[PDB]
Write a protein that holds these residues in place. Structure first.
Motif, PDB file in Angstrom:
ATOM      1  N   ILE A  49       0.823  -1.186   0.000  1.00  0.00           N
ATOM      2  CA  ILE A  49       0.000   0.000   0.000  1.00  0.00           C
ATOM      3  C   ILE A  49       0.882   1.272   0.000  1.00  0.00           C
ATOM      4  N   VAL A  50       1.971   1.269   0.761  1.00  0.00           N
ATOM      5  CA  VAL A  50       2.806   2.452   0.857  1.00  0.00           C
ATOM      6  C   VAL A  50       3.585   2.675  -0.433  1.00  0.00           C
ATOM      7  N   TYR A  51       4.054   1.594  -1.040  1.00  0.00           N
ATOM      8  CA  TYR A  51       4.760   1.733  -2.316  1.00  0.00           C
ATOM      9  C   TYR A  51       3.854   2.191  -3.468  1.00  0.00           C
ATOM     10  N   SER A  52       2.631   1.676  -3.500  1.00  0.00           N
ATOM     11  CA  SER A  52       1.678   2.102  -4.509  1.00  0.00           C
ATOM     12  C   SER A  52       1.259   3.556  -4.305  1.00  0.00           C
ATOM     13  N   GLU A 105       4.126   5.910  -4.738  1.00  0.00           N
ATOM     14  CA  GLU A 105       4.522   5.891  -6.147  1.00  0.00           C
ATOM     15  C   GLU A 105       3.600   6.780  -6.985  1.00  0.00           C
ATOM     16  N   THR A 106       2.302   6.698  -6.753  1.00  0.00           N
ATOM     17  CA  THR A 106       1.394   7.638  -7.404  1.00  0.00           C
ATOM     18  C   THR A 106       1.491   9.052  -6.835  1.00  0.00           C
ATOM     19  N   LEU A 107       2.009   9.185  -5.622  1.00  0.00           N
ATOM     20  CA  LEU A 107       2.273  10.514  -5.082  1.00  0.00           C
ATOM     21  C   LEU A 107       3.459  11.161  -5.800  1.00  0.00           C
ATOM     22  N   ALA A 108       4.502  10.365  -6.043  1.00  0.00           N
ATOM     23  CA  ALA A 108       5.683  10.849  -6.775  1.00  0.00           C
ATOM     24  C   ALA A 108       5.350  11.099  -8.241  1.00  0.00           C
ATOM     25  N   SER A 135       2.780  14.540  -7.958  1.00  0.00           N
ATOM     26  CA  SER A 135       3.435  15.800  -7.588  1.00  0.00           C
ATOM     27  C   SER A 135       4.654  16.064  -8.468  1.00  0.00           C
ATOM     28  N   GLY A 136       5.248  14.998  -9.008  1.00  0.00           N
ATOM     29  CA  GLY A 136       6.360  15.115  -9.951  1.00  0.00           C
ATOM     30  C   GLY A 136       7.690  15.451  -9.295  1.00  0.00           C
ATOM     31  N   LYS A 137       7.698  15.653  -7.975  1.00  0.00           N
ATOM     32  CA  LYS A 137       8.919  15.992  -7.261  1.00  0.00           C
ATOM     33  C   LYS A 137       9.909  14.832  -7.268  1.00  0.00           C
ATOM     34  N   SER A 138       9.574  13.812  -6.481  1.00  0.00           N
ATOM     35  CA  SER A 138      10.396  12.644  -6.159  1.00  0.00           C
ATOM     36  C   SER A 138       9.546  11.877  -5.138  1.00  0.00           C
ATOM     37  N   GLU A 139      10.118  10.844  -4.535  1.00  0.00           N
ATOM     38  CA  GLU A 139       9.347   9.965  -3.676  1.00  0.00           C
ATOM     39  C   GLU A 139       9.199  10.531  -2.255  1.00  0.00           C
ATOM     40  N   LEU A 140      10.328  10.551  -1.550  1.00  0.00           N
ATOM     41  CA  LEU A 140      10.298  10.789  -0.118  1.00  0.00           C
ATOM     42  C   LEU A 140      10.509  12.245   0.250  1.00  0.00           C
ATOM     43  N   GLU A 141      10.736  13.105  -0.732  1.00  0.00           N
ATOM     44  CA  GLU A 141      10.627  14.531  -0.466  1.00  0.00           C
ATOM     45  C   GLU A 141       9.208  15.037  -0.705  1.00  0.00           C
ATOM     46  N   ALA A 142       8.437  14.344  -1.550  1.00  0.00           N
ATOM     47  CA  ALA A 142       6.989  14.589  -1.602  1.00  0.00           C
ATOM     48  C   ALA A 142       6.337  14.081  -0.326  1.00  0.00           C
ATOM     49  N   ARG A 177      -6.613   6.264  -1.033  1.00  0.00           N
ATOM     50  CA  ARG A 177      -7.032   7.045   0.136  1.00  0.00           C
ATOM     51  C   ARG A 177      -5.819   7.743   0.733  1.00  0.00           C
ATOM     52  N   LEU A 178      -4.708   7.038   0.815  1.00  0.00           N
ATOM     53  CA  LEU A 178      -3.511   7.604   1.394  1.00  0.00           C
ATOM     54  C   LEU A 178      -2.724   8.452   0.415  1.00  0.00           C
ATOM     55  N   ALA A 179      -2.774   8.123  -0.877  1.00  0.00           N
ATOM     56  CA  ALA A 179      -2.170   8.991  -1.886  1.00  0.00           C
ATOM     57  C   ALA A 179      -2.936  10.313  -1.983  1.00  0.00           C
ATOM     58  N   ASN A 180      -4.255  10.258  -1.905  1.00  0.00           N
ATOM     59  CA  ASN A 180      -5.043  11.486  -1.897  1.00  0.00           C
ATOM     60  C   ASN A 180      -4.926  12.226  -0.585  1.00  0.00           C
ATOM     61  N   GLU A 181      -4.632  11.530   0.507  1.00  0.00           N
ATOM     62  CA  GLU A 181      -4.478  12.218   1.792  1.00  0.00           C
ATOM     63  C   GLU A 181      -3.117  12.921   1.881  1.00  0.00           C
ATOM     64  N   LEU A 182      -2.064  12.264   1.396  1.00  0.00           N
ATOM     65  CA  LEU A 182      -0.769  12.923   1.296  1.00  0.00           C
ATOM     66  C   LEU A 182      -0.780  14.059   0.252  1.00  0.00           C
ATOM     67  N   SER A 183      -1.535  13.900  -0.827  1.00  0.00           N
ATOM     68  CA  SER A 183      -1.663  14.973  -1.802  1.00  0.00           C
ATOM     69  C   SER A 183      -2.476  16.136  -1.231  1.00  0.00           C
ATOM     70  N   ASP A 184      -3.495  15.845  -0.431  1.00  0.00           N
ATOM     71  CA  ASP A 184      -4.239  16.910   0.244  1.00  0.00           C
ATOM     72  C   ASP A 184      -3.458  17.561   1.371  1.00  0.00           C
ATOM     73  N   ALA A 185      -2.418  16.877   1.847  1.00  0.00           N
ATOM     74  CA  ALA A 185      -1.541  17.455   2.854  1.00  0.00           C
ATOM     75  C   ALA A 185      -0.343  18.183   2.237  1.00  0.00           C
ATOM     76  N   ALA A 186      -0.078  17.975   0.948  1.00  0.00           N
ATOM     77  CA  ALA A 186       1.020  18.689   0.281  1.00  0.00           C
ATOM     78  C   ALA A 186       0.693  20.187   0.111  1.00  0.00           C
ATOM     79  N   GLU A 187      -0.555  20.494  -0.244  1.00  0.00           N
ATOM     80  CA  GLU A 187      -1.066  21.871  -0.197  1.00  0.00           C
ATOM     81  C   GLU A 187      -1.913  22.124   1.067  1.00  0.00           C
ATOM     82  N   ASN A 188      -1.610  21.360   2.118  1.00  0.00           N
ATOM     83  CA  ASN A 188      -2.174  21.460   3.464  1.00  0.00           C
ATOM     84  C   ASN A 188      -3.647  21.867   3.597  1.00  0.00           C
TER      85      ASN A 188
END
Lengths: 101, 206, 151
Positions: free
Chosen positions: C41-44, C47-50, C53-60, C118-129
Motif C-alpha cells: 500500500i505504501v509503495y503504490s 509511487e502515485t504521489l511521486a 506531484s512530480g517531485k520525487s518519492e520521499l521529499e513529496a 485514500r492515502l495517496a489522496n491524503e498525502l496529496s491533500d496534505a502537500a497543499e495542506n
RNA sequence: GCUUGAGUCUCGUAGAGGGGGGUAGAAUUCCAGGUGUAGCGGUGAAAUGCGUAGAGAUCUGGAGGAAUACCGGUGGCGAAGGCGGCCCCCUGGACGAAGACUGACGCUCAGGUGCGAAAGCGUGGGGAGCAAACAGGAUUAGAUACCCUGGUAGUCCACGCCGUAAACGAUGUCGACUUGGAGGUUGUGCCCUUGAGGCGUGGCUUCCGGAGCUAACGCGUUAAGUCGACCGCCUGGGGAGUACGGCCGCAAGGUUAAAACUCAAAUGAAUUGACGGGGGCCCGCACAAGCGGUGGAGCAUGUGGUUUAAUUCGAUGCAACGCGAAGAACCUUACCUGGUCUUGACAUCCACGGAAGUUUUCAGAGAUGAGAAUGUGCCUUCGGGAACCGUGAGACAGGUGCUGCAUGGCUGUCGUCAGCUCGUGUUGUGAAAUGUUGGGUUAAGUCCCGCAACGAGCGCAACCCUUAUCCUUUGUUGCCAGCGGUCCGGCCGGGAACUCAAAGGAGACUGCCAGUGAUAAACUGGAGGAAGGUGGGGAUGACGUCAAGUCAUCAUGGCCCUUACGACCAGGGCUACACACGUGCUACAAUGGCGCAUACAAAGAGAAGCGACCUCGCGAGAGCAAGCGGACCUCAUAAAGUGCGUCGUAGUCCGGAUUGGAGUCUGCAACUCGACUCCAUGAAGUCGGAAUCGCUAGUAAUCGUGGAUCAGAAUGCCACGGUGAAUAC
C-alpha cells in the motif's frame, strides 16, 4: 581458602576482617574476665554498665564530663589526649606484667 | 492451601521414585493399579512392623518389592515364614512371580514415615500432642538431622475448633531443591475425627 | 516507566528507499501483523504521489508530512486539584510519530476506493495542506494556542 | 527585750501598669470634581452584585470613624481579666545600691467586699471597616451550612448592669531546704575600659535536664522533689450542674444544690495493630503514552430468574458465572414418572443343594420362570474341602443423605508481595521494645556502613527445567559438504564434514576498563562476547488472612434412612424460555470476498488405534487395503503469504444466522437430543450508549496446527509454531 570460589572466598576473608577487628583481643580469652579497664567512662558506658551488672571491677579514667557510675576504681584524668593515655596505659601495662613471675 | 509436596519437586534432583519399572501405554495403568494393591495390602499387613517405604520394580514380568522397614526381624520372623507368606500373596495380587526384600532402616527417628506414624499412634493412644511433637523433634535433632519440622493439625485435644500448632528446630530449607528433605504424612483417626500429622526432616544439603 | 527508563529498539529501514522514517510509516499503517500488505500500500500510494506531484518519492512524502507535524500539544496536569490543559513542546520523534498517525488515521477515514488511493489522496491533500490531518494539526494548535496562558 | 521575718526613709532604674486630655501618619469607605473607556468584582468554576445614567483604574480636594504597620522579641508590665503610635497631666506597683529607723508589727482566710475577656442588657451618642440575624447567588440528593455578593444589631464613646470563659502554667497562698547547663531581660559592684571585655552579686523570665517523685506522660531550685501553716475542693458513669426552694439580676440568666430511676462500667496514660479525604520515600499495564477488544448484532457456552413431573448437586464481590465437567443421546446421573427387589447391586462369616460355564424358546421394559447337552478343575476311615451359583436366618451391607461453622487432605486469595519470626542479652512496673530502626543501595530485611545489640530460622537470591553460543562422543530411520554414476527423487554406492538427535562439558560471575560514591555497598558508561548485568520464560508461592472453597474425588466425628433417604430397570430431564448478566466465536468488509497457481513450520497422537496407495461418490464418506506400536508408516495439505483475474462501495460476489429438502458416520438407538456434507433460503449487522478490559517484545494483534477427555460429539481448555507492531514524557 582458594577452594571452589573466588567471590565467596573474598566474602569470607572480609568476614575475617569484620570478626577480627570487632572480636580482636577477646578471641583468646575463653572466660569472662576478672577485671575491666576502660579508657573513657562516658564513651564506654555500655561496658561499665555490663561489668557492674556482672560483678567485675571497673577501672576507669574518667574525665570531667564522665560519671563515676559503678566504676570501682575511679581515676580522674584525661580521656582523649594520646600523651595522657600512652603514659597512662604504659603504667597500667607496666604493673600488669608483674605476676609472681 | 499453598505448598508443593517436597518429595515431588525433588523427584529428579535428589529423591528417587518408589516405582522404577518401565511400561508402555498398554500396561501402565495395570502395573500402576497392581502397585496400589501391593502397597495397600503390604501397608495394612505390616502395621505393627514400622514400615517406611515399599519400592516396586519390575524386571521382565516379575515384581521385586523392597520393604524399607525399621524392625526387619518382625517382618521376617522366626525362620522367614512371614516373608514367604508375603511373597505368596504378593504373587497372588500382582499375578507375576514375586520376589521380596527387606532393607533395615536404622536410625528410625530420622524417617518421616516412622515419625508421623509414631506421633499418630501416640495421638490415638490419647496422649497430649505437645509431648508427642516435642519429643519427636528432640529425639530426631539428637541424631544428625540438620532440621526437623512437625505439624499436627485439626481438632487437637478434642476441641470444637481446629488448630495447627507446628514445631521446628534447626534449618529446614524447603525452597532449596538440593536439600535432602525427607517429608511424610500420616492421619490419626481419633474419637474426635482425623488429626493430620506432617513431618519434614532436613538431612543434608546435597 | 514508573522506575524503568528504557532504550529503544532499532527498526530495519525501508527495503526500497532505505528510510527508517518511511519504515515506521509502514508500521503505523500495518494491521494484524501483515507487513507485506502495508508496504504494498505504501509503495503504490507514494509511487502515485511521486508521479502526481512530480517531485520525487520521499521529499513529496517529507513535504506532505512536514505540513502535518504538530508544534506544541496540550497535556493534562491535575496538580492543584484542577484540570489544566497545558501546552507542551513535542519531541521530534513524537512529532513525526503524531504526523504519521494522523495521516494514516485520516486516510482510513476517507471514502475512496483502495487504501493506496485514500492515502495517496491524503498525502496529496496534505502537500497543499488542505486535508484532514492538517485540520487535526490546526485543531491541536488551536487547543495549545487558546490555552497558552499555562507555562 | 533582740534582729536574721514584716515594714518606713534616702537615691536611682526599666516598664504596652491605670485614668483623663490632645495630636500624627498610612489605609478603607463615602462625597464633589478632572482624565478615560468597556468592563469591574468574584470563584474550584460560576452567578447574584456594580457598570456606557460612564463603573473599575487614575489624580485633586473634603468628611468621618475605628485601629494604631516597621520597632516587636518563648520581650515587658500588671493580683488576675488584660495592657502596643507620639505628647502632656493625675496616679499604682516592682527592682536595685549603701545607710538609717520601727521592732514580730507576720502567714493564711470560712462568711464579707472589691476587681473581673468576650458576648449580652439599659439610657444617650456615634457608626469608616468588619459582621451574628437577614436577603439574594451558588454547591448539593437536600444545604435553614461551608464559598460568593450585600447587610442590621453589635463591635466604638459616656454612665450603670451582668458576672461568666479551655477566666489554663487544666498546677491555691505564704515560707524553708535540695546536683547542673544554655539563654533572655533589668539593676549594681570590682578590675589595664588598654573595644563590641574579664570577675562577681541581686529581681523577673525561657529551654533542656540530675536525684527525687509520678499510673505513665512528664515535673525537675519558677517542682508535680523534701517539709511546715492556712484555705478551697473530690468520692463510680448517667440523670445533672438539672429540677424544686432561697439569694442576686431589667432580662438573658448567675449562684447554692438534690432525688427517683438506670448501667457495670465511665475514666487516665501508655503499648501493638489497623485506619486517615495526615506527612515522607518506593513499587505494579495502576495511571499516563499507544494498540486491540468488551458493552450494540447473530450464534456458542456458563449463570440468575422463570417454567417444570424433574429441570440433580456444588461454586457467587475481587478470588462464582465454557467454574467442578479433560467432553449429559442410552450410559454418565446423583433428578422426575412408572415397574420392581429386600442380608440385598457391592462385602465377610455360616448351613444345605449343585461344578461353574456354554448355546435355546416363550411373557414382559430388563431381570424372574420352562426346557437340552455339558457337568467330577484335584484331594477326602467319606461327615467334605478348591472355584462359582441359588436358597434361608442373620450380625450387617448400603447412602452423590445433613453438617466445610466439628475435621483431615487438597485448593483459591492478599501475593512471587518482601516480608514473618525466634534464642540469648538489654530497656520498660507492664502490655511490649530492641534486633528488624538510621545513611546509602537493591528486583529483594539485597548488600555495605553505623548502631544495646549479638546471632539464628522461614522467605529473597542460588541449586532445578527450558531457551540463546561453542566443543567432545555416537551417527540409525536422521543429514548430504566433497566424491562416482544416476531411472535426477538422498535415489543408490558412499561420506561422516553440516543441519539435527541426545548424552557429557565450556560459557555470564559486575569477570575486565573508565567515571561517580563512606577509599564501602553499589550505580552509570565502555570493551570483549551468542548472550551483560536477577539475559528470556517456567517451576518454586514465607508467618498468616478470609470460621474463603470442597462432607459430591477420597478419608472422616456426630446426626439421620436402613422392606428405605438402599438396589435394579425403561422412558424422560439435566438441552425447558416473557427475560437479565458473564465469558467466547463469527461478523459488519476492498489492508477485503471469490477463482486459479504457488512457497515457507513447530509441537504432538496412534493397536477395540492412526489408517497410505488405488477405485467409486459433487461432498461428508464407502470398498479393497499396505505400512506403522512408530526420528522409518499414518493422522497430514499448514494457513495467513505471494503472483494473476474478477468484484467495486452496493446491505453488495460482505455476513452467515434461520429454515426446507436430500444424505454420510458413530452408536442397541441421533424424536426430545449428535457431528459433518450437498442443494436451496439468505435474518440481524454498515464498527457498537453509559461504562469496561488485556497487553511493555517475538509481547499485543493476526494466521493456522496438535492434544486430553472421547464410540461419536469443541467457538472451551491445554500446547505448538507463521507473520509481527505501536508506545512508555
Amino acid at each position: 581458602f582458594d577452594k571452589l570460589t573466588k567471590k565467596e572466598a573474598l566474602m569470607r576473608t572480609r568476614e575475617l576482617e569484620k570478626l577480627e577487628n570487632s572480636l580482636g583481643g577477646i578471641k583468646d580469652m575463653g572466660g569472662l574476665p576478672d577485671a575491666l579497664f576502660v579508657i573513657d567512662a562516658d564513651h564506654e558506658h555500655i561496658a561499665i554498665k555490663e561489668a557492674n551488672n556482672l560483678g567485675i571491677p571497673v577501672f576507669a579514667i574518667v574525665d570531667t564530663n564522665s560519671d563515676p557510675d559503678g566504676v570501682d576504681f575511679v581515676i580522674p584524668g584525661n580521656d582523649d589526649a594520646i600523651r595522657a593515655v600512652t603514659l597512662y596505659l604504659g603504667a597500667v601495662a607496666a604493673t600488669v606484667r608483674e605476676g609472681r613471675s | 492451601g499453598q505448598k508443593v509436596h517436597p518429595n515431588g519437586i525433588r523427584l529428579g534432583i535428589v529423591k528417587p521414585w518408589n516405582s522404577t519399572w518401565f511400561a508402555n501405554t498398554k500396561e501402565f495403568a495395570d502395573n500402576l493399579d497392581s502397585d496400589f494393591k501391593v502397597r495397600q495390602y503390604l501397608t495394612k499387613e505390616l502395621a505393627k512392623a514400622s514400615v517406611s517405604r515399599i519400592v516396586i520394580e519390575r524386571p521382565a514380568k516379575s515384581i521385586r518389592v523392597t520393604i524399607h522397614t525399621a524392625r526387619p526381624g518382625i517382618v521376617i520372623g522366626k525362620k522367614g515364614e512371614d516373608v514367604e507368606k508375603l511373597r505368596k500373596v504378593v504373587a497372588d495380587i500382582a499375578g507375576v512371580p514375586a520376589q521380596i526384600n527387606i532393607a533395615e532402616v536404622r536410625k528410625p527417628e530420622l524417617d518421616a514415615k516412622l515419625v508421623a506414624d509414631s506421633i499418630t499412634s501416640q495421638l490415638e493412644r490419647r496422649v497430649m500432642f505437645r509431648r508427642a511433637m516435642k519429643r519427636a523433634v528432640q529425639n530426631a535433632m539428637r541424631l544428625g538431622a540438620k532440621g526437623i519440622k512437625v505439624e499436627v493439625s485439626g481438632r487437637l485435644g478434642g476441641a470444637e475448633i481446629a488448630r495447627t500448632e507446628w514445631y521446628r528446630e534447626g534449618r529446614v530449607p524447603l525452597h532449596t531443591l538440593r536439600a535432602d528433605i525427607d517429608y511424610n504424612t500420616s492421619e490419626a483417626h481419633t474419637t474426635y475425627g482425623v488429626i493430620g500429622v506432617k513431618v519434614w526432616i532436613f538431612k543434608g544439603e546435597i | 516507566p514508573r522506575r524503568r527508563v528504557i532504550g529503544q529498539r532499532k527498526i530495519l529501514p525501508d527495503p526500497k528507499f532505505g528510510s527508517e522514517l518511511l519504515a515506521k510509516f509502514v508500521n503505523i499503517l500495518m494491521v494484524d501483523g501483515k507487513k507485506s500488505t502495508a508496504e504494498s500500500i505504501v509503495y503504490s500510494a507514494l509511487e502515485t504521489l511521486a508521479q502526481r506531484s512530480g517531485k520525487s518519492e520521499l521529499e513529496a512524502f517529507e513535504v506532505a508530512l512536514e505540513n502535518v507535524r504538530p508544534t506544541v500539544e496540550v497535556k493534562s496536569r491535575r496538580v492543584g486539584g484542577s484540570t489544566y490543559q497545558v501546552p507542551v513542546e513535542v519531541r521530534p520523534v513524537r512529532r513525526n510519530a503524531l504526523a504519521m498517525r494522523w495521516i494514516v488515521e485520516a486516510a482510513r477515514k476517507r471514502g475512496d476506493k483502495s487504501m493506496a488511493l485514500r492515502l495517496a489522496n491524503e498525502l496529496s491533500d496534505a502537500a497543499e495542506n488542505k486535508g484532514t490531518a492538517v485540520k487535526k494539526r490546526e485543531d491541536v494548535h488551536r487547543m495549545a494556542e487558546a490555552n497558552k496562558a499555562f507555562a
